[PDB]
Design a binder for these strands. Structure first.
Ligand SMILES: [Zn+2]
Ligand SMILES: [Zn+2]
Lengths: 209, 240, 179, 302, 116, 399, 48
DNA sequence: CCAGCTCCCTGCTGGCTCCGAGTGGGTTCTGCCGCTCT
RNA sequence: GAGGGAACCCACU
DNA sequence: AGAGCGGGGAGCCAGCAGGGAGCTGG
């Protein structure tokens, strides 16, 4: 049905806006709170007819501090995604000279596709994100506390205060859903702020492994 | 020392006279048990004549068992409350219960008024024979005395069916103790070996034997648990 | 706990018997052997098992069960420790003569009356004189040994106060009474 | 709700179990769907798993080589209105199970036509609730219709989510699962709102669902929350589950001990079970590992 | 409508359903031998999901002879007017949703069974 | 006391009768037959050798074993080429010493008045019921077991079988280890649900209809007469149909026995030897209680069909599943059955040793003495060891 | 084995005796490995 | 063209280790019977 | 002024 | 002849047999 899939497309787009805003990318306040009425007016109502088309939903954002640091958000039409699809999207990333992208798939990627993503990761960073996983913002859940990605100066200041090594910190996997949400690689440190029954506030730090 | 040497003057006992209730209380308990058994018979007639409406989330057995158990538990509670209201200030069961030294009001209820329903695995006494709990009952007898409701007290003494069903109930507790010991000990051993080397270090962090930080402060506030107390925040609940 | 048990006071574990005299009685009491029946006769008949061996079928199970109980209660062909069960709903009759079955004596009740009369008690007040004993009480058809699988088809009164009853008598078909 | 507590639930918690005995979700609803009972029942029906076997009263198979002359002779009129394999699958749906699921028969029919890709055609009418199935174009067609009939009965989802076997709707009378809000007066007000409990875990689908609260809807499954929400979220969920197990009796344990146990099981980024498989696979020395368990194996390994 | 197992008259095996396209009709064929037969019913199979309601066809009259069954006087037999009847619940696995009482007349040579 | 009295009066005699006779060939032919047992009263033989009636207090104080000698009558027949049978009768041959339960029939305290017991320094209130082994009073605790020869249908949880019929079939009137058959039904997790049979000493499942053909019933009508007794029941037809579908490919008896013998403990290389192995399994070893001789196939087939019928009754919900902890489903091995199981094993070992000795003395020699053939230490020390230690079996397999 | 390889010996007895040597050494190290008989004392109890 | 075709995904299934703490007391058993040689 | 183990059973909290 | 001596469940982890894209190859 067109109405419910339009609802999914709007919710995916809103979650991507919140995600890009959380990563520091310049996303304006109008498109954070884009209502379903506004999405229907701007994009369409009948995706099977093709008024909202997934390749028309492709987002381009830029970082706040660095305008040239840009990230694409792609929405493939086909449910699976194979090698030719990443090849097309990566040629597109070459011809705007952009090294970061998200791929919001519907059903998923074949293992060769993920292997190709890992292979091309040193030059262009490509993050697969299922539509089912993006249908909510998990950082708005009550169980998920506040994650802040730390800069390198802050990490060095942390490890000098606690006289710590990197492997002596607590760990978080690079495939963690919040780690995938914030798009963080190994060696980065996440400052977790959470409330505390005993202290009120507690700040944990987690190295990405 | 002081209280034990005053107890030589005052003295403290328990006897068969502390488990006696009034004649009026015996009549009240008998009336409550008779009315509750009649209510169970009425629910049985409703289910037998297909007039029992199932509740959301439950089958017809589950609604019938829940309603019968609610009636029987209300009977046990009301007979118990009558038993405790019958007690004098000189009663010694009450003397040890209100001091918290030994026993509960449930023990007073069972000794004085009604032992109550005997349960095996959370349900009533099962049909261990072909649709009978014992061969002294008719088949498909879902009444209280057939399925393990002991309507006698410990002073009145249990009938042979009630005695057997109470033995069935107590065997459950014996089994639960004897099979919970090993699993609980294994859980304790695994917890110890998982956290034996975790300790507060001299920079007040909490780290294991690999020197990896588990907590930056103990309990997130750095305080020992033997000196913290329950308190109330005076600004949380009041209105603006 | 619960794995090591103790016998009740009047519990007796059956010692074992041979199925042969019961089989010879059953062959000459209108039971039809499995070799000489058409299978179509099985559907409306009662299967007969002796020590778990299906030996034939019978068409009148109540009369056969009455005859069998009458034979056991007078210490005839069927000895006192033989178990005889009628699965009435399932249309089966199981006879057990093997060892290991645990039984207990029960007072036989016929038509809401104990077969134990005052003459039995007056005879049992003088064991050392009349040579009346418990075995004479068994041979009189007054008590009989009921094991667990037979006990699941009997109807027990806890006391003879149950036999004498009024209002909602609960039951008027008591077959046995607790001693 | 048959939720496990006490020692077995604590065993399922410290041993990080992929198969809880009674996995569950605590689904919270948004807005008016939380308030009135009928929209919450709509949410329940759209979460409750419904196969064809739930709503079916009968499935029969016929040899009907001429649909113009139906052998059943009760379906004749509307089959002649509509009017191929000679093999007929006549499906009669039970009336009450057709009604309480809030289904209409065209939804069922389009589910079959979507699932099988119109390799097999479906006629339907009701006013007796009857569908008819034929196969459009040596493994005989009656045996193939056997196979697709079993596939329709067992592995076909009409509405709901597959892992959720059952849903209980209830309105909590205690503040433990009530909606606590801060009014304009500034007090804490407990709002009674309808909440759902499940008998399976498919938390990601349920969180994505219409009118389900994406903030407070939680599970009792530790592995599933770890896979869906992360490691700090499963640290908090494990804290909550351990606190529930401990304080079911009314007993109190200081928070720092629970926090230390949860921090120990979640310090290295994954769920470390309190087993040999979790503790013996850390970077501890061989002597601690051999003191715990599998002594000879650990010492050969080292 | 249930369908049972139909047997080949020569070799006494089970007749499998089959169609012949020329007559385009349903014929039951044995496949131990080459026998065929016209099918009286076009029914090959019915599956009966919610038709386990009938239990009276499973009761036999011999339960009137059960001494452990409850007896009543307040439900006279419609078939013969006997006052006394045994009553019981259903002894099946479908009893988990029913406390339905079935009554059987205790008079011999009648054996009538009913409900309420 | 009653169980021990049955053990001595009946069980050892039937164990001796049940023992197959010793056929030995080089060739001269030797037949050994054990006919009639005799049990004496408990007597002691000192180093002087004079037999004495041994009191229980003497056994308790002197750490003796309160046992009685067991004598048996043996007949030896010799068959020579061109020479008639030679019949030698060894009367009352000592073969071992059976420990005697106190105050049983063959105890010296039997039938004694309280004055007679007090003159023997025995307590008249002492119940008896125990043995004296090396001066130690040993009591045989009764052992629970599932009842034999009875079909029990259970539901194996978390298994690929949904329902399972079971019968620990044991031959009555004889001591013989139980062989269990499992007629079961697969779980729904297959177009239909099929009825299968797990057989003794057969490593693999074989379907039930193949077994029914293997006893000699090739028609499906004949098999269904043994499984379904009223053909007007359609549901039980609907559940027996998948078994016929799965087992259609076998249609005659000999290929069915081939299919049975294909997965024994050792598959026979010769097809005829496989057929003989299948006959030996389906006759001697599958349901021994309904029949063990030849041409007893109809009773065995009827009982197997009853087992399938009970399985289908449980699968329909038409009959309630049996309870393992129901105590009419249990039997209690007392001193009688336990000592009879031991004595069967040890008499088998004694026959093995006598047969080995006589084969050794006919392979190179010409004759053997039977008094030297019988090692009474086998029975005596096996009974003494099992009663003394409680490890209930053989000495070298005590773990 | 040293006597057997010191003189002339068949290959199969060498292989069988190597199998016995391997079994004895492995049962010295571990006497509960499945699929092989337990190394036992002459009394019948397994070795530790 | 489209049939050929390798290499990481799922799933059954056998191996495999684990199953509370601390105390008394007892008994039976290891350590066994044939010999080959004088 | 101190010379066995192992297995099993019973019991205690 | 006689003595000493030879001789139960419950839960993991890994490994195999079937899938299915897919680059290389007409
Ligand atoms: Zn044929
Ligand atoms: Zn009538």
């Amino acid at each position: 049905d067109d109405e419910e899939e339009t609802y999914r497309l709007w919710k995916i787009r809103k979650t991507i806006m919140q995600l890009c805003h959380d990563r520091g990318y310049l996303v304006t306040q109008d498109e954070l709170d884009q209502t379903l009425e506004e999405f229907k007016a701007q994009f369409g109502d009948k995706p099977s007819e093709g008024r909202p088309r997934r390749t028309d939903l492709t987002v381009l954002v830029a970082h706040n501090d660095d305008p040239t640091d840009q990230m694409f958000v792609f929405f493939p039409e086909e449910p699976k995604v194979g090698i030719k699809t990443i090849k097309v999207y990566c040629q597109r990333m070459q011809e705007e000279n952009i090294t970061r992208a998200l791929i919001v798939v519907q059903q998923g990627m074949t293992p060769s596709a993920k292997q190709s993503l890992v292979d091309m990761a040193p030059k262009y960073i490509l993050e697969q994100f299922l539509q089912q996983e993006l249908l909510i913002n998990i950082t708005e859940h009550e169980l998920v506390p506040e994650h802040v990605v730390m800069t390198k100066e802050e990490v060095t200041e942390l490890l000098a205060r606690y006289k710590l090594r990197e492997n002596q910190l607590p760990r978080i996997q690079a495939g963690d859903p919040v780690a995938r949400y914030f798009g963080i690689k190994r060696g980065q440190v996440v400052k977790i702020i959470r409330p505390s029954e005993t202290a009120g506030r507690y700040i944990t730090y987690r190295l990405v492994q | 020392t002081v209280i034990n040497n005053w107890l030589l003057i005052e003295g403290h006992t328990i006897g068969i006279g502390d488990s006696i209730a009034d004649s009026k209380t015996y009549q009240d308990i008998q009336n409550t048990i008779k009315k509750a058994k009649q209510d169970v018979i009425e629910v049985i007639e409703k289910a037998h004549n297909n007039e029992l409406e199932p509740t959301p989330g439950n089958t017809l057995r589950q609604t019938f068992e829940n309603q019968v158990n609610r009636i029987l538990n209300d009977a046990r509670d009301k007979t118990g409350s009558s038993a405790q209201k019958s007690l004098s200030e000189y009663n010694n069961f009450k003397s040890m219960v209100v001091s918290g030294a030994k026993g509960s009001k449930i023990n007073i209820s069972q000794v004085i008024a009604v032992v109550g329903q005997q349960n095996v695995e959370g349900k009533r006494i099962p049909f261990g024979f072909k649709h009978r709990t014992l061969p002294h009952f008719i088949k498909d007898d879902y009444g209280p005395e057939s399925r393990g409701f002991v309507e006698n007290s410990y002073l009145a003494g249990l009938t042979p069916t009630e005695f057997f069903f109470h033995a069935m109930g107590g065997r459950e507790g014996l089994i639960d103790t004897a099979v919970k010991t090993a699993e609980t000990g294994y859980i304790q051993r695994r917890l110890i070996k998982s956290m034996e080397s975790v300790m507060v270090k001299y920079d007040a962090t909490v780290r294991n034997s690999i020197n990896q930080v588990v907590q930056l402060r103990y309990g997130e506030d750095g305080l020992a648990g033997e000196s913290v107390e329950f308190q109330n925040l005076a600004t949380l609940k009041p209105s603006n | 706990v619960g794995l090591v048990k103790n016998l009740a006071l009047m519990a007796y574990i059956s010692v074992g018997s041979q199925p042969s005299p019961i089989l010879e009685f059953l062959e000459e009491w209108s039971m039809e052997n499995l070799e000489e029946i058409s299978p179509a006769a099985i559907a409306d008949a009662t299967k007969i098992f002796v020590n778990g061996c299906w030996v034939g079928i019978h068409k009148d199970p109540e009369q056969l069960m009455n005859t069998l109980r009458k034979l056991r209660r007078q210490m005839d062909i069927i000895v006192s420790e033989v178990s005889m069960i009628r699965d009435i709903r399932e249309r089966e009759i199981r006879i057990y003569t093997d060892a290991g079955r645990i039984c207990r004596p029960l007072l036989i009740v016929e038509k809401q009356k104990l077969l134990l009369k005052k003459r039995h008690i007056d005879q049992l007040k003088e064991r050392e004189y009349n040579n009346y004993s418990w075995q004479d009480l068994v041979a009189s058809g007054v008590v009989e040994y009921i094991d667990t699988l037979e006990e699941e088809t009997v109807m027990l009164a806890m006391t003879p106060d149950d036999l004498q009853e009024k209002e909602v008598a609960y039951c008027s078909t008591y077959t046995h009474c607790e001693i | 709700k048959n939720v496990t507590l006490g020692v077995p639930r604590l065993k399922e918690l410290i041993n990080i179990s992929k198969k809880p005995k009674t996995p569950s979700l605590t689904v919270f609803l948004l807005g008016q769907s939380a308030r009135d009972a009928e929209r919450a029942k709509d949410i329940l029906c759209r979460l409750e798993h419904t196969t064809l076997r739930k709503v079916t009263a009968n499935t029969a198979i016929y040899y009907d080589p001429n649909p113009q002359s139906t052998v059943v002779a009760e379906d004749q009129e509307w089959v002649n209105v509509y009017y191929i394999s000679p093999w007929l699958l006549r499906v009669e749906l039970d009336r009450k199970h057709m009604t309480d699921r809030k289904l209409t028969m065209e939804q069922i029919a389009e589910k079959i036509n979507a699932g099988f890709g119109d390799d097999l055609n479906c006629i339907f009418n009701d006013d007796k609730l009857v569908l008819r199935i034929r196969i459009m174009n040596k493994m005989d067609d009656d045996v193939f219709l056997r196979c697709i009939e079993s596939n329709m009965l067992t592995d076909m989802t009409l509405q709901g989510i597959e892992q959720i076997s059952k849903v209980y709707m209830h309105l909590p009378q205690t503040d433990n699962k009530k909606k606590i809000i801060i009014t304009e007066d500034g007090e804490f007000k407990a709002l009674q709102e309808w909440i759902l409990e499940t008998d399976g875990v498919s938390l990601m689908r349920v969180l994505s669902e219409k009118d389900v609260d994406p903030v407070r809807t939680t599970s009792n499954d530790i592995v599933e929350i770890f896979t869906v929400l992360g490691i700090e979220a499963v640290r908090k969920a494990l804290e909550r589950e351990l606190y529930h197990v401990i304080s079911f009796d009314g007993s109190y344990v200081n928070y720092r001990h629970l926090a230390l146990l949860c921090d120990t099981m979640t310090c290295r980024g994954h769920l470390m079970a309190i087993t040999r498989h979790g503790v013996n696979r850390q970077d501890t020395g061989p002597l601690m590992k051999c003191s715990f368990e599998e002594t000879v194996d650990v010492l050969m390994e080292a | 409508g249930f369908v049972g197992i139909r047997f080949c008259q020569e070799c006494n095996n089970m007749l499998y359903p089959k169609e012949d396209k020329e007559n385009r009709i349903l014929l039951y064929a044995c496949r131990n031998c080459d026998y065929q037969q016209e099918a009286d019913n076009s029914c090959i199979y019915v599956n009966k999901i919610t038709h386990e309601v009938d239990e009276l066809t499973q009761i036999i009259a011999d339960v009137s002879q059960d001494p452990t069954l409850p007896r009543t006087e307040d439900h006279p037999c419609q078939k013969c007017g006997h006052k006394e009847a045994v009553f019981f619940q259903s002894h099946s696995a479908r009893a988990e949703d029913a406390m339905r009482l079935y009554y059987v007349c205790t008079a011999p040579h009648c054996g009538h069974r009913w409900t309420e | 006391l009653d169980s021990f009295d049955e053990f001595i009066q009946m069980s050892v005699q039937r164990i001796v009768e049940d023992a197959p006779p010793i056929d030995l060939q080089a060739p001269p032919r030797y037949l050994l037959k054990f006919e009639q047992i005799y049990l004496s009263k408990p007597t002691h033989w000192e180093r002087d050798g004079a037999p004495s009636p041994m009191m229980p207090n003497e056994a308790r104080l002197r750490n003796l074993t309160y046992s009685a000698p067991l004598y048996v009558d043996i007949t030896k027949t010799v068959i020579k080429e061109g020479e008639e049978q030679l019949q030698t009768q060894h009367q009352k041959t000592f073969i071992g010493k059976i420990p005697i339960m106190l105050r049983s029939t063959y105890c010296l305290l039997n039938g004694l008045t309280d004055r007679d017991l007090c003159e023997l320094n025995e307590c008249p209130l002492d119940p008896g019921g125990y043995f004296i082994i090396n001066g130690s009073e040993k009591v045989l605790i009764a052992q629970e077991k599932m009842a034999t020869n009875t079909v029990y249908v259970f539901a194996k949880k978390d298994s690929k079988y949904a329902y399972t019929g079971e019968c620990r079939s044991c031959l009555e009137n004889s001591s013989r280890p139980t062989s269990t058959i499992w007629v079961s039904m697969l779980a729904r997790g297959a177009i239909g649900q099929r009825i299968v049979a797990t057989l003794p000493y057969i490593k693999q499942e074989v379907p039930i209809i193949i077994v029914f053909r293997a006893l000699g019933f090739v028609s499906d009508r004949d098999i269904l007469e043994h499984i379904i007794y009223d053909f007007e029941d359609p549901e039980m037809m609907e559940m027996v149909k998948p078994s016929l579908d799965e087992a259609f490919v076998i249609q005659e008896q000999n290929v069915a026995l081939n299919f049975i013998g294909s997965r024994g403990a050792k598959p026979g290389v010769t097809k005829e030897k496989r057929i003989k192995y299948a006959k030996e399994v389906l006759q001697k070893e599958m349901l021994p209680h309904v029949g063990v001789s030849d041409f007893c196939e109809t009773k065995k087939a009827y009982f197997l069909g009853y087992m399938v019928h009970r399985l289908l009754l449980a699968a329909l919900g038409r009959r309630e599943l049996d309870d393992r902890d129901h105590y009419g489903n249990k039997r209690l091995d007392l001193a009688g059955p336990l000592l009879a199981f031991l004595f069967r094993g040890m008499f088998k070992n004694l026959l093995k040793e006598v047969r080995i000795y006589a084969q050794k003395f006919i392979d190179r020699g010409k004759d053997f003495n039977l008094e030297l053939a019988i090692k009474t230490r086998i029975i005596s020390d096996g009974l003494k060891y099992s009663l003394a230690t409680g490890n209930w079996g053989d000495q070298k397999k005590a773990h | 084995l040293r006597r057997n390889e010191q003189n002339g010996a068949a290959a199969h007895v060498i292989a069988e005796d190597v199998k016995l040597l391997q079994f004895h050494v492995a049962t010295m190290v571990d006497n509960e490995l499945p699929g092989l008989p337990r190394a036992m004392q002459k009394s019948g109890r397994p070795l530790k």
